[PDB]
Ligand binder design. Structure first.
Ligand SMILES: [C]O[C]1[C]([O])[C]([C]OP([O])(=O)[O-]P(=O)([O-])OP(=O)([O-])O[C][C]2O[C](N3[C]=[N+]([C])C4=C3N=C([N])[N]C4=O)[C]([O])[C]2[O])O[C]1N1[C]=NC2=C1N=[C]N=C2[N]
Ligand SMILES: O=c1ccn([C@@H]2O[C@H](COP(=O)(O)OP(=O)(O)OP(=O)(O)O)[C@@H](O)[C@H]2O)c(=O)[nH]1
Ligand SMILES: [Mg+2]
Ligand SMILES: [Mg+2]
Lengths: 50, 1208
RNA sequence: UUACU
């Protein structure tokens, strides 16, 4: 198959042992409405709508 | 074919048919003058180029191959290049071009007749060009140059590398090599007279740069910038230009470390484990930025402008602390070729050992006491540079007089008059009147004392050797200029001995009188690794320049007061040819002689101090007898390491008493002085430390010393080992692989490969690619070290050929009139380069039967009985456990040729050549000589040590020869019979005994397997779950804690996975060798320590008895016992392995650290030592197979006979 | 032809 280049896999063990932190979430603007992030599916697909 | 289209050059490993190709090509390329000329010089390789590449980093670089006209057609002789004075007394003083100027071979010739001084000049300059140019370590000159250039084909797989273009353009004449060396007639004899005189050095420069290309220090395009700089040095004088570049071309990193600026480094703890990493910003302070402006002007004009342009890119492009380390080791190998700088020593007498007076005169002591002759007996200093030194040193005279009191010196005389060497004398007319055997013995120190054993108590013995002139020994180093040192005879060695014993006991008293090099590993630097890791420190590392010269007689006197002032408070009766008596002593501020009571130490020291003759007198083949103008330090006396240690310790420590005397602080931390290398450490603000750093310079400047000048924030050197930022930089070029100039203990033997294995292990943490260095050591191991030449006799020449040609080819040689010995040389096949007893070198992956290959043996592989496992490793160990057999494949070992190599092991040629030399000398003549030696010493009951050695062996088991005392009286005599020769009558009965050894072992051979090995056949099985990585690995992730320990390499991961270095082991080993002759690598063999432990662990109630076979004192007994009890956790005597601490600097000593890495299912714990034996199994296979370590954890399976063997 | 730590 692939298996990559044991130098690059020796730094794989070094990578997944000493992990770190990122991803600051601030942007952060004025919104004079309702800030919608998720949608909701209906709980019961019951009726046809002929 | 040829060596760049082989299957081994592609894989890069040993397929079963690929190994027959490497046998066939190297043996063909070994023993031909012609084939060699084919390989270096086919017409199929293009001329190269305007080449471009990447100079060992991310960026790119281009350079052109330029050859100057001073090499392609050199000038004529120009006899104003080596002028004389108005008389022919000496060379003209202040002459330049003191070394061998490149002048084109032909022009030197004799014209005129065998006298009239100038004839001996042109004859000895011919000895400079034809004799003092070659120094080939293993093979001849051409086999060695072919060993890089073949290995550099196999590694990079092509022939478009541009080093071979320098091989082609510098020398090619189309029929044969431009020059070869004779061996039998000893000179380099030329075949083209129009070729340059300097070219036999350029073999070794092309040798060294290709070693640096292979090491990974230099890339291909960087070696263009290298080679152009070397040939530019060769325009007028190839070494005189190099010695001026040597200072400038490596002082430049302190600018590049300044420019990098903020650089993230590991830090160390007190007990040298890595505890943290911090980012510490390297900007060197304001007063060394003023030293940058003065130095970069000298960089611009003294250097070749392409070598200068390579440096100015490394200042500007460098971005990390790792990045300057890349350029610095690579710019360092551009200024050196490792060639030892050899000329005739009449040229270097003016440069090396002529005394200089740098600026000040040093004034004299107030003499307080004088004996009947007006000479110094007791003396004290008055407001000088010395009064600063005796403010520190005179406090020790009340304690050392109880340590210099309590040795009994006549005993310590015979133990320091070991190391057989020379006396000056050629004995004389009385060499006839002592005996013709002891005529030939008469070189050693222990023998020239034995011949004159009667004279040792007479005081006229020392008086008749002031008449004898001191002869100039010369010895040279890697980068220093041709240096001379004084070989004193036994009586001039005697007067210097009491100042050696007095100045020795300041070492145990003061730490800072410092480190002897017994560690080899990190403890020789574990001081320097710590203080650089710290904050608010500036580090200075001082060499004075030349420190043999500078020591005038007046500066020498500051050590003389310290040696006197100890000896007055002491009580030593008789010392030698003296006795404590009643002398007339003048007491200054008395009129009139008043008789003090003086002891022998007192008398001896006063006489030696008074009497001192300093000149070295060299007999010349040109001149009559040139004599150095005295006032230097004659550096061989006894105290040549203490006189420059005790002095500089008094001057720098005495400074912080004098600075504390007038209201200034001291602000100096620990200082390590191994004379002359001063290295002190400061702390405070950037202004306070500098006010002290000037006065340490200025008092050494007013002591008459030329301190060069070195200091920096985050830079520190000692014993030619650079430490910076908490990382270790290498100095790889100082270990020259291929230049020796020893003329003493030459091997072309098994021992010639031990000289490779010790130097290959010197470079394992000075290299950026240790796998490539294993490629280089293999072919030089293969091509060069291949042929052992032996002189048989004719009748036995027939069957010596027939028996050994059965297994491996033996060369035959053309027959002789009227010497009756034909030469013949055996060819020593490539398996012998891998044997446990032969060449102990680590291998490449072989092929099993199916064949799924072995593990690639890395640079950390341990030697002795482990290379016998490699024989079983080929036979599929995992398979063997399957069939439950100790059985062995004779097919696969005979196919590669392993079977033909262990025959050469069992022939045992080396001790057989030692046996015939041991056969010829009468032990009766030795015993009368050596009974007279124990008359000088003890006196009695050196007999009790011989009795203790013999009582131990007959009751128990053999304690061998060198170690126990009075045998090591006898063994110290033996070395002159070992020295004084092989020659031909003894050599004819070498062949009679060896041929009897041959016909017995050839009559059938099978691989002899021992009951003492079950004890490999264990193999590790990889699993699917990873290790932890030991949190100090995150700290040494950045940046470049050594050279090979870059992030994601083999040596870094071994320092991560195997991990650690304990302090607990190699402090006791650092405590052991303080008994037994410490100053270097001291690798673990130590035949006291292993032989004493095999009695201690298994056996000891006898262990009272062989301590007086050492004649170990009660203190000396206490050192060894603490090391024996700590060496009982690990490991086994039953399974032998040897590595060196030079091989594994930061890697752990202990197999305890590897038991974390391998589980053993605990039904295998089956004997009392068997936990401690399985650790070495876990210890070695991690270090052996580190290039194939994903970071999985391996698990051990065993053969049931290995379970069965350790049960007992 | 060849030193000491
Ligand atoms: C007894 O015997 C002996 C020995 O063996 C010897 C040695 O030899 P070798 O060295 O081995 O040779 P080599 O080196 O091998 O060679 P090569 O290198 O291979 O090649 C070669 C070459 O060489 C030459 N050659 C030269 N030279 C000079 C010579 C030669 N050869 C001969 N044979 N000779 C001579 O001289 C060429 O050229 C080429 O090229 O030795 C011996 N040894 C010797 N001698 C002696 C000895 N021992 C002791 N003693 C003495 N005297
Ligand atoms: O074989 C040796 C090598 C070195 N030494 C040691 O050499 C010291 C004196 O030699 P120096 O160390 O003072 O030479 P130098 O540095 O001033 O020369 P440059 O680098 O400036 O060119 C002595 O104090 C001693 O201990 C020997 O005694 N024997
Ligand atoms: Mg020095
Ligand atoms: Mg030095």
């Amino acid at each position: 198959k692939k298996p990559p280049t044991v130098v690059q896999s020796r730094t794989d063990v070094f990578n997944e042992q000493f992990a770190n932190e990122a991803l600051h979430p601030m942007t952060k603007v004025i919104f004079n409405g309702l800030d919608v992030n998720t949608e909701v599916q209906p709980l019961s697909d019951d009726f046809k709508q002929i | 074919t040829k060596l760049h289209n082989t299957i081994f050059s592609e894989t890069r490993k040993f397929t079963r048919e690929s190994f027959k190709e490497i046998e066939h090509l190297t043996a063909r390329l070994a023993n031909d003058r012609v084939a060699r000329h084919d390989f270096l010089f086919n017409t199929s390789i293009v001329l190269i180029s305007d080449y471009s590449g990447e100079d060992s980093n991310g960026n790119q670089l281009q350079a052109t191959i330029t050859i100057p006209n001073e090499i392609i057609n050199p000038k004529e002789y120009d006899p104003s290049d080596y002028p004389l004075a108005e008389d022919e007394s000496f060379f003209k003083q202040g002459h330049k071009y003191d070394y061998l100027v490149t002048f084109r071979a032909g022009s030197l010739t004799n014209t005129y007749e065998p006298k009239t001084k100038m004839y001996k000049l042109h004859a000895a300059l011919d000895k400079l060009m034809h004799v003092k140019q070659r120094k080939s370590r293993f093979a001849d000159l051409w086999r060695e140059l072919c060993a890089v250039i073949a290995s550099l084909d196999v590694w990079y797989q092509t022939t478009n590398y541009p080093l071979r273009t320098y091989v082609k353009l510098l020398f090619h004449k189309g029929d044969e090599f431009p020059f070869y060396e004779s061996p039998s007639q000893d000179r380099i004899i030329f075949n083209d007279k129009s070729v340059a005189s300097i070219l036999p050095t350029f073999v070794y420069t092309c040798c060294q740069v290709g070693t640096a290309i292979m090491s990974g220090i230099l890339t291909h395009v960087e070696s263009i910038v290298a080679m152009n700089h070397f040939l530019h040095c060769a325009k007028d004088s190839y070494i005189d230009e190099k010695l001026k570049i040597k200072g400038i071309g490596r002082s430049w990193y302190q600018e590049a470390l300044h420019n990098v600026c903020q650089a993230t480094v590991p830090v160390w703890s007190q007990f040298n484990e890595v505890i943290g990493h911090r980012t510490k910003s390297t900007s060197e302070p304001h007063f060394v930025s003023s030293t940058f402006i003065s130095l970069r002007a000298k960089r611009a004009e003294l250097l070749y402008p392409e070598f200068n342009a390579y440096i100015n890119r490394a200042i500007q492009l460098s971005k990390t602390q790792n990045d300057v380390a890349n350029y610095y080791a690579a710019c360092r190998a551009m200024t050196n070729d490792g060639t030892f700088l050899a000329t005739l020593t009449e040229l270097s007498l003016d440069a090396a050992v002529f005394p200089r007076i740098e600026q000040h005169l040093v004034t004299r002591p107030a003499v307080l006491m004088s004996n009947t002759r007006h000479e110094s007996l007791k003396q004290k200093y008055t407001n000088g540079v010395g009064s600063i030194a005796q403010s520190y040193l005179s406090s020790f005279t009340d304690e050392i007089a109880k340590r210099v009191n309590g040795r009994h010196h006549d005993e310590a005389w015979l133990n320091f008059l070991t190391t057989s060497s020379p006396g000056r004398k050629l004995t004389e007319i009385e060499k006839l009147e002592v005996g013709g055997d002891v005529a030939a013995w008469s070189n050693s120190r222990i023998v020239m004392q034995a011949v004159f054993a009667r004279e040792y108590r007479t005081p006229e013995r020392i008086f008749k050797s002031l008449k004898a002139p001191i002869k100039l020994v010369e010895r040279q180093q890697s980068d220093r200029r041709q240096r001379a040192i004084s070989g004193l005879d036994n009586d001039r060695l005697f007067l210097s001995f009491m100042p050696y014993t007095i100045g020795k006991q300041i070492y145990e008293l003061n730490d800072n009188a410092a480190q002897g090099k017994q560690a080899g590993n990190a403890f020789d630097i574990g001081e320097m690794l710590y203080w650089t890791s710290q904050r608010n420190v500036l580090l200075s590392s001082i060499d004075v320049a030349g420190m043999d010269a500078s020591v005038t007689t007046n500066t020498k006197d500051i050590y003389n007061t310290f040696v006197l002032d100890v000896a007055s408070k002491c009580t030593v009766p008789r010392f030698g040819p003296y006795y404590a008596k009643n002398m007339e002593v003048f007491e200054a501020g008395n009129r009139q002689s008043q008789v003090r009571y003086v002891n022998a130490a007192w008398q001896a020291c006063a006489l030696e101090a008074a009497n001192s003759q300093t000149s070295t007198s060299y007999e010349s083949e040109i001149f009559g007898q040139v004599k150095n103008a005295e006032g230097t330090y004659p550096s061989g006396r006894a105290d040549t390491s203490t006189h420059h240690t005790v002095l500089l310790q008094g001057l720098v420590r005495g400074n912080e008493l004098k600075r504390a005397s007038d209201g200034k602080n001291s602000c100096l931390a620990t200082i390590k002085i191994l004379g002359d290398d001063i290295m002190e450490i400061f702390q405070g603000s950037e202004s306070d430390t500098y006010d002290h750093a000037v006065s340490n310079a200025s008092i050494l400047n007013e002591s008459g010393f030329a301190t060069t000048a070195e200091l920096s924030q985050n830079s520190i050197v000692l014993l030619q080992q650079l430490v910076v930022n908490g990382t270790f930089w290498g100095f790889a070029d100082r270990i020259s692989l291929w230049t020796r100039e020893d003329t003493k203990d030459i091997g072309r033997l098994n021992l010639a490969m031990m000289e490779l294995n010790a130097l290959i292990d010197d470079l394992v943490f000075r290299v950026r690619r240790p796998e490539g260095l294993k490629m280089l050591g293999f072919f030089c191991g293969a091509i060069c070290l291949r042929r052992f030449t032996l002189s048989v006799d004719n009748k036995l020449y027939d069957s010596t050929y027939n028996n050994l040609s059965k297994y491996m080819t033996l060369t035959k040689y053309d027959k002789n009139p009227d010497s009756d010995s034909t030469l013949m040389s055996l060819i020593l096949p490539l398996a012998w380069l891998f044997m446990p007893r032969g060449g102990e070198y680590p291998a490449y992956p072989f092929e099993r039967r199916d064949g799924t290959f072995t593990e690639d043996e890395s640079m950390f592989t341990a030697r002795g009985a482990y290379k016998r496992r490699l024989l079983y490793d080929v036979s599929n160990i995992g398979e063997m456990i399957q069939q439950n057999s100790m059985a062995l494949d004779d097919d696969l070992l005979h196919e590669y040729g392993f079977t033909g190599a262990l025959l050469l092991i069992d022939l045992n040629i080396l001790d057989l050549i030692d046996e015939v030399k041991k056969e010829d000398i009468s032990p009766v003549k030795v015993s009368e000589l050596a009974t007279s030696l124990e008359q000088l010493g003890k006196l009695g009951e050196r007999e009790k040590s011989r009795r203790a050695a013999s009582d131990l062996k007959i009751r128990g088991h053999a304690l061998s020869n060198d170690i126990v005392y009075g045998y090591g009286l006898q063994e110290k005599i033996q070395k002159s019979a070992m020295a004084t020769k092989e020659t031909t009558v003894q050599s004819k009965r070498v062949s009679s005994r060896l041929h009897d050894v041959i016909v017995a072992k050839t009559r059938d051979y099978k691989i002899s397997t021992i009951p003492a090995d079950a004890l490999h056949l264990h193999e590790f099985e990889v699993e699917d779950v990873t290790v932890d990585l030991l949190p100090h690995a995150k700290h040494t992730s950045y940046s470049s804690l050594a050279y090979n320990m870059s992030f994601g390499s083999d040596g870094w991961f071994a320092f991560a996975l195997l991990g650690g270095l304990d302090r607990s082991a190699n402090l006791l080993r650092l405590d052991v060798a303080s008994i037994r002759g410490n100053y270097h690598k001291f690798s673990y063999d130590d035949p006291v320590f292993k032989q004493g432990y095999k009695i201690y662990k298994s056996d000891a109630t006898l262990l009272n008895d062989f301590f007086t076979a050492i004649s170990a004192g009660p203190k000396e007994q206490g050192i060894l016992l603490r090391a024996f009890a700590y060496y009982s956790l690990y490991g086994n005597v039953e399974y032998h392995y040897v590595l060196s601490p030079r091989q594994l600097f930061f890697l752990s000593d202990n197999p305890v650290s590897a038991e974390r890495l391998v589980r053993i299912p605990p039904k295998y714990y089956v004997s009392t030592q068997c936990r401690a034996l399985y650790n070495i199994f876990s210890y070695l296979h991690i270090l052996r197979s580190i290039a194939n370590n994903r970071g999985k954890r391996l698990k051990m399976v065993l053969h049931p006979g290995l379970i069965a063997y350790v049960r007992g």
